[PDB]
Amino acid sequence: KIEEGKLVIWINGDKGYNGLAEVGKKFEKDTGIKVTVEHPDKLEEKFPQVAATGDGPDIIFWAHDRFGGYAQSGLLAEITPDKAFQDKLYPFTWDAVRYNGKLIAYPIAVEALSLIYNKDLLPNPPKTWEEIPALDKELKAKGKSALMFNLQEPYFTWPLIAADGGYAFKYENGKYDIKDVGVDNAGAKAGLTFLVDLIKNKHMNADTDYSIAEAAFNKGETAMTINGPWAWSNIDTSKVNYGVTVLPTFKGQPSKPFVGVLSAGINAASPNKELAKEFLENYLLTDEGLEAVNKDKPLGAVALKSYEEELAKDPRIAATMENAQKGEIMPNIPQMSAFWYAVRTAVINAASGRQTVDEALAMDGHWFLKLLQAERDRMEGWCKQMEREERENNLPEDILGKIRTAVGSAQLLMAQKFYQFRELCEENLNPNAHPRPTSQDLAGFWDMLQLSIENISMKFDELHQLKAN
């Protein structure tokens, strides 16, 4: 049940956990406090599980995108770095660890897609997407391809799609507006249209996946590809003389890839919050701390200004950071599951022809059904959490009333309104009226449903701001 007087850290298996342990030994040498570095399986699944029951590590390292949900569940403590410390990291990274105006984690590393090119086939990579079709024709005459990347996952096509105005969910002071999704707008349309055309004009195949693209580039068959730092080691052994640079612009605007920020959050149940802060602020987030982690497993670009300036001496890291600063921070909320599923479908259908670009990106029944599912999942999660506390502990009197009410309102809303909304959506999807709910009608109902979800969300926050008190 989280021991006091020490620190236990969880970090993923693909990170530099040995170097982290190195920093850990140094902390123990100066303070006498031991630091244990573990890397269990599916820790992103385990953390919330064990954390909800007062257990788990003092510190958890993980992509920032999962932390919004954790904070919403009351699993992370609010961190307290001062103005001087925050000034040591790039501003944009702090925006990735905010939940309802509060800081819930320390940014460590930054990751984003970049344009990777074969210096032998293309010494001067294109600066715009618009000049790629012409470049492809020139290369095709030589049997080569201009560009090949994974068109199956929205993560990979998003940069182009979001370039001229697209975005997932609107962001405001550590809060994402689920009623404001930026997939159905002029910019997102222009982007998917350019991509669609590339496929039509034989410049790309709708079936190109991650492996096909990786194979084509590593075998010198295509002058460029779009991929992340995780693919660099494979290219290094291919011996292809490559370079990494800023993604091409579209309609004059920067491509906007999603940004993932590896972060360190402090377990709300941790009795060692002050030790964790000391360790994170003065031992890990230092040139020496990050250097040790990086030598064990490259972190890519880092959030610490002083050390990134150093790491950026490497053009590839420089490119990653450049693309990351022009990108979109991945929303740190569970409803992104709906976004991923919908956008993927939209692209798949739009590329082939199953639907036009407008129909594909239109927010109809399909989108809302996916969003509703996402809301059901988080709310049911909160209820199980709270009824488990009432079921375990005693905490009689007041708190029980607050729990029953919070849970009661959520379950009714789901058993009643969620049920109705789901049917309205399926009707919207049926061409033969009833009357036929309009996309706008769905939007209106959804915006109303979100008002209710937010209120309930507040009561649960109200409860967490205590625990089982």
Swiss-Prot record:
Gene3D superfamilies tied to this protein: Periplasmic binding protein-like II
Single annotated GO MF: maltose binding
Superkingdom of origin: Bacteria
Keyword match 4Fe-4S: no
GN (gene name): malE
GO biological process, one term: carbohydrate transport
Location within or outside the cell: Periplasm
Subunit structure: The complex is composed of two ATP-binding proteins (MalK), two transmembrane proteins (MalG and MalF) and a solute-binding protein (MalE).
Family: Belongs to the bacterial solute-binding protein 1 family.
Induction: Induced by maltose and the transcriptional regulator MalT. Permanently repressed by cold shock in a PNPase-dependent fashion.
Organism: Escherichia coli (strain K12)
Presence of the UniProt keyword Cell membrane in the record: no
Pfam families, alphabetized: SBP_bac_1
Protein name listed in UniProt: Maltose/maltodextrin-binding periplasmic protein
UniProt GO cellular component terms: ATP-binding cassette (ABC) transporter complex; ATP-binding cassette (ABC) transporter complex, substrate-binding subunit-containing; maltose transport complex; membrane; outer membrane-bounded periplasmic space; periplasmic space
SUPFAM superfamilies: Periplasmic binding protein-like II (SSF53850)
Role noted for this protein: Part of the ABC transporter complex MalEFGK involved in maltose/maltodextrin import. Binds maltose and higher maltodextrins such as maltotriose.
Lineage: Bacteria, Pseudomonadati, Pseudomonadota, Gammaproteobacteria, Enterobacterales
PANTHER family, per the entry: MALTOSE-BINDING PERIPLASMIC PROTEIN, MALTOSE_MALTODEXTRIN-BINDING PERIPLASMIC PROTEIN
UniProt KW keywords: Periplasm, Signal, Sugar transport, Transport
Membrane-spanning parts: none
